[PDB]
Amino acid sequence: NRSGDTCFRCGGMGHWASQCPGSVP
Residue ranges that bind Zn ion, judged by CB under 5 A = 7, 9-10, 20
DSSP-derived 3-state class of residue 19: helix
21 φ/ψ angles, rounded to the nearest 5 degrees:
-70, 120
Q: Please identify, using beta-carbon distances, which residue of 10 and 24 lies nearer to Zn ion.
A: 10
- State how far the Cα of 5 lies from the Cα of 19, in Å rounded to an integer: 12
Minimal distance in Å, beta carbon 5 to Zn ion? 10
DSSP-derived 3-state class of residue 9: coil
Minimal distance in Å, beta carbon 18 to Zn ion? 8
Minimal distance in Å, beta carbon 25 to Zn ion? 13
